[PDB]
Structure formats: structure tokens, C-alpha cells
């Protein structure tokens, strides 16, 4: 029954004590934390508590759109020798550090995902020619489906795959995604491997990455500029904001204390000394 936004427990008036009861004394060895309160070790007055833990709730803590990646695409002049640049990003929360550290305060997680897309474009050459309003195509390519090889090949038809046709200058694109995990909950950490090295079978064959499950967790985001090659080249950037909604978390963990080094828990030399100098007897 207790709501995240209900007022915390009121402080009760407490007088002097000369008894056989020893709240202050305990034994951390047992694995437990002393449930003590001000009134147990000192003389307290009566206080009607109005404060709440509303903003510190799991949803409230993550109820914010966080940048997980920056995709770069473009639309050159037909003539250019180099290919029209279309973006292919492998979906994940580890390419950036902020949101990853927050999710990582916990072992397992569960949640509906809200993806918001902020698109910005600009001119690259000290030219003067212009360009008509661009229309972007954000296609979701799930593991197994034909991944695009050309800004304009057959795959962009998206007969089955989900595509978002964004129009430049308009309110940032947005879509919702359910809990799509092949497991009963997302695994922020996997203490094992995708393969079992069998004696009877050649070393190289049974080999696999540590802490890495499905080589292709959730497929990829394939972005392109639908508009045909324009005399004057225009480069665009797609910023992807990820927000975890209707979220649940299990088994808490100590926050990442040192600089992230790859998709795993690996740390790197020269970054292992976080804490600063401060003397035992100095305030």
C-alpha cells in the first residue's frame, strides 16, 4: 500500500534512558544493517514529517531521455566519386557512458523503450548553392533481415521491417517499443559464454567472447537521406535519445567507479585511481 510519494515517517518525542536495552550496540558481521533512528541514541522532539521519496523511485530516477548515439549520414553531388553516405548503427546503451552507468546500478532490468530522434543538418562546402528540404528514412533491421548495402538498394522497401519517415525542420521523431528480450529480463551482466569449448573438437571452434550472449542482441538502426543526389553537398546528424519507461529492476550493484573500457567490465591501465588525497584527521 505505501506510495512512492507518501510522507516519510514522523520523528517521535524521546526522553532520557537508563536501561538494559542496547540499540547503539551491534554486530555488522551478521551481514545486517542496524535499523537505528535519531530517537534511539539521543533525546528527540516530536516532528511531523512532510518529506517524500517520490523523485528517487525507479521510474522517476530514469524518467529522462538520454543520448545513446550520434548517427552520421549525407547526400553528395551525383558526380562525386565517393558513395552516398548512409548510416548503420548496432542498437545499444553502451556506446555512451551516462545512461549506461545508471542502468548498471543493477544486474537485471525490464522495460518499455521510448526512442526519440533529434535530426540536425548542415552545409559542408564553402559553396553557395542550396538544397530542398530533406526527408530521412530510419529503418529498423532486426537480427536475420537483409542489411542495406546501398543508400538506395531493395532493402529500403521495408515491406515487413518498421521504418520512420522523418521530415527535416519538424518536431523530433518518436516511437515506442515493448519489452523485446528473448529472456524474462534484460541482462546488464552475463557471467559466462555463448559457446562450450568441447575437448574432442578443435580449439578455435569452441571459442567465444567473455560476458557476451547473442552475437546480435537487438539488430540495427539503418538511416539514410531519401532525397536524390544534390549538386551542393549536405551533411546530416541523427541524435538518438533513449528513455526507459514502465521499468523494473533487480539485484542492486555498486556503481562504475572507473572509466569504462569497452562493452564489458574491463578496466584499463592509468585509470584505476579515482579517489583523491585527503588526510585521516583533516575536516
Amino acid at each position: 500500500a505505501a506510495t512512492s510519494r507518501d510522507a516519510l515517517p514522523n520523528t517521535e518525542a524521546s526522553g532520557p534512558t537508563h536501561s538494559k536495552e542496547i540499540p547503539a550496540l551491534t554486530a555488522v558481521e551478521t551481514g545486517a544493517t542496524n535499523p537505528l533512528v535519531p530517537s534511539d541514541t539521543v533525546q528527540t522532539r516530536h516532528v511531523v514529517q512532510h518529506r517524500s521519496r517520490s523523485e528517487s523511485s525507479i521510474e522517476s530516477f530514469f524518467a529522462r531521455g538520454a543520448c545513446v548515439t550520434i548517427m552520421t549520414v549525407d547526400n553528395p553531388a551525383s558526380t562525386t566519386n565517393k558513395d552516398k553516405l548512409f548510416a548503420v548503427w548496432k542498437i545499444t546503451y553502451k556506446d555512451t557512458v551516462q545512461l549506461r552507468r545508471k542502468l548498471e546500478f543493477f544486474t537485471y532490468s525490464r522495460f518499455d523503450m521510448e526512442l526519440t530522434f533529434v535530426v540536425t543538418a548542415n552545409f559542408t562546402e564553402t559553396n553557395n548553392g542550396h538544397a530542398l528540404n530533406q526527408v530521412y528514412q530510419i529503418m529498423y533491421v532486426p537480427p536475420g533481415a537483409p542489411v542495406p548495402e546501398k543508400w538506395d538498394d531493395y532493402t529500403w522497401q521495408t515491406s515487413s521491417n518498421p521504418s520512420i519517415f522523418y521530415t527535416y525542420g519538424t518536431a523530433p521523431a518518436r516511437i515506442s517499443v515493448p519489452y523485446v528480450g528473448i529472456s524474462n529480463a534484460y541482462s546488464h551482466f552475463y557471467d559466462g559464454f555463448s559457446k562450450v569449448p568441447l575437448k574432442d573438437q578443435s580449439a578455435a571452434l569452441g571459442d567465444s567472447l567473455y560476458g557476451a550472449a547473442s552475437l546480435n542482441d537487438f539488430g540495427i538502426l539503418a538511416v539514410r537521406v531519401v532525397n536524390d543526389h544534390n549538386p551542393t553537398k549536405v551533411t546530416s546528424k541523427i541524435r538518438v535519445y533513449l528513455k526507459p519507461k514502465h521499468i523494473r529492476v533487480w539485484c542492486p550493484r555498486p556503481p562504475r567507479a572507473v572509466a569504462y573500457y569497452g562493452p564489458g567490465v574491463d578496466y584499463k591501465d592509468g585509470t584505476l585511481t579515482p579517489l583523491s588525497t585527503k588526510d585521516l584527521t583533516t575536516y
Binding site: 558481521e29 567507479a257 564489458g264 578496466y267
Partner: protein, 268 residues
């Protein structure tokens, strides 16, 4: 009990094995959840499961390690550590899938004149950091799984420099819990402290924890048992004292699915 009963004195009995202790600091039950069999509402694999019961759900005592002024800490992984233990290891290898809880009993006695504190921690999905700075998540299956003898922590991070023929193994630094996070905070995890002046040991009852109802026991390790010296071993005046740390563990309410021919892993 005015009758005699007490927190410090316990008696644990599983199958044909019984453990007694006159100096315990009570016992801990991970996340308040006592080990249990897979429920029908939560079940996945449709085949009649194999439940060894007393044959596997009993107490196995691993190789006794030595605690000294120099020791930086020790680590083990479940089920990996029990992989070669009687009928439990046999049933684990014969089946594709398997799930199990554990009763972890860490034994370490001394004397009223000795000092020291062992921080005993039960960590879910205890992913450890590798020995390489040129590559990542590269620690080999053979090295990531020491079996019964387990592994150990280092006071210093020293990168594998042999690019040609990589050690392909873990470099778990003590103060960083071997995984990029500050040891001082490891306590958010199910644990107990073996403080020589207060108690002989640590008893942790661990439930089956995981993103799935049941999984591959051979490919994946559910729990990590980390033992670090919070306060260094110390005795009378001896410059180089020593005391044994014996680790006894018992699988619980454990069950297996997908029976076939025995799995012969490349453990070396």
C-alpha cells in the same frame, strides 16, 4: 532460549552430510529468498526434469586455501566450483539445462589472540575484468572457470603485454572488486563478515538468480563467491602468521533438463 539455544551455535543437515558450528554470527538468506524448485507458472523446458535430491543436494568440501599477511583475496564461481563434485557434476554435464541454489559455508577459525576480518561476498553475475589493454572481453573459457581451486585477487593491475600469445585471463584488482567498482560498496550484495574476534565462519543461503527460469550451467555461472581481507591477518607478534580458510558448499532444490550424452569440456 532460556533452554539454551543461540545465534552463534548452529547445525546444518543436507542428505548424508552435517555441519556444526559453536561460533557463528547468525546466517544470511540472499535477498530474503530461500532456494526453490521451478514452478509450473514460470517453467520453460517441457520435458520431465531430473531432480537428484540427496545424491547432489548435499555438502561438498573444496580444497582448503591458506590465509596470510600477504593474501589479497580469493574468488570462486557457481556452479563452476562444483563441476567435478560427485553426482552433482555428473548430472550437470549430462544435461543441456540446469538450475540450482546453494548453501555456502565458509570455515575459518583461529584464537582469542589473533586479529583479522574476512569479507565474504555472494555476487550475482560476477563478471570479472581481463588482463588485456589492447583488446576486451577476451578472457578464455578455460581461464574464466578455475573449477574447485578457484582464483585470486591482486593488489595491482598488470596488463598482459604478449600480443603474440595472449595469457587470455583475468586481472581482478582487490580494491575494485575485480570488476571496475569500489570494494567498500560490495556490501550492497548478500554477505557476511568473518571477524576473528567474533566468529569462526560465514553461512550464506543462495537462491537461483537469473534473467531466465533455467539456463546452461556449463556456459553460464549464476553466482560469484568473493572472499577478501577487510582487515589483515595478524597474530601475537609472529611476522608471518597463517590460518586456513576451508570452503564447504551444498547445492539446493536443484533440477535438470534436456538429457543427452555427457558433455566433455575443453577445460585446459
Amino acid at each position: 532460549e532460556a533452554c539454551g539455544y543461540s545465534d552463534r551455535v548452529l547445525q546444518l543437515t543436507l542428505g548424508n552430510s552435517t555441519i556444526t558450528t559453536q561460533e557463528a554470527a547468525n546466517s544470511v538468506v540472499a535477498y530474503g529468498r530461500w532456494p526453490e524448485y521451478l514452478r509450473d507458472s514460470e517453467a520453460n523446458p517441457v520435458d520431465q526434469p531430473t531432480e537428484p535430491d540427496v545424491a547432489a543436494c548435499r555438502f561438498y568440501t573444496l580444497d582448503t586455501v591458506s590465509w596470510t599477511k600477504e593474501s589479497r583475496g580469493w574468488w570462486w564461481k557457481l556452479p563452476d566450483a562444483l563441476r567435478d563434485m560427485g553426482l552433482f557434476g555428473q548430472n550437470m554435464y549430462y544435461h543441456y539445462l540446469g538450475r540450482s541454489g546453494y548453501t555456502v559455508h565458509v570455515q575459518c577459525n583461529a584464537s582469542k589472540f589473533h586479529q583479522g576480518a574476512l569479507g565474504v561476498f555472494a555476487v550475482p553475475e560476477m563478471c570479472l575484468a581481463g588482463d588485456s589493454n589492447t583488446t576486451t572481453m577476451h578472457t578464455s573459457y578455460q581461464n574464466a572457470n578455475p573449477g574447485e581451486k578457484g582464483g585470486t585477487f591482486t593488489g595491482t593491475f598488470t596488463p598482459d603485454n604478449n600480443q603474440t600469445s595472449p595469457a587470455r585471463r583475468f586481472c581482478p584488482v582487490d580494491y575494485l572488486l575485480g570488476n571496475g567498482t569500489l570494494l567498500g560498496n560490495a556490501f550492497v550484495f548478500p554477505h557476511q563478515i568473518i571477524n576473528l574476534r567474533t566468529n569462526n565462519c560465514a553461512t550464506l543461503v543462495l537462491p537461483y538468480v537469473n534473467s531466465l527460469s533455467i539456463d546452461s550451467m556449463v556456459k553460464h555461472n549464476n553466482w560469484g563467491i568473493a572472499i577478501l581481507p577487510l582487515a589483515p591477518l595478524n597474530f601475537a607478534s609472529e611476522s608471518s602468521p597463517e590460518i586456513p580458510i576451508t570452503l564447504t558448499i551444498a547445492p539446493m532444490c536443484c533440477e535438470f533438463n534436456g538429457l543427452r550424452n555427457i558433455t566433455l569440456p575443453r577445460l585446459q
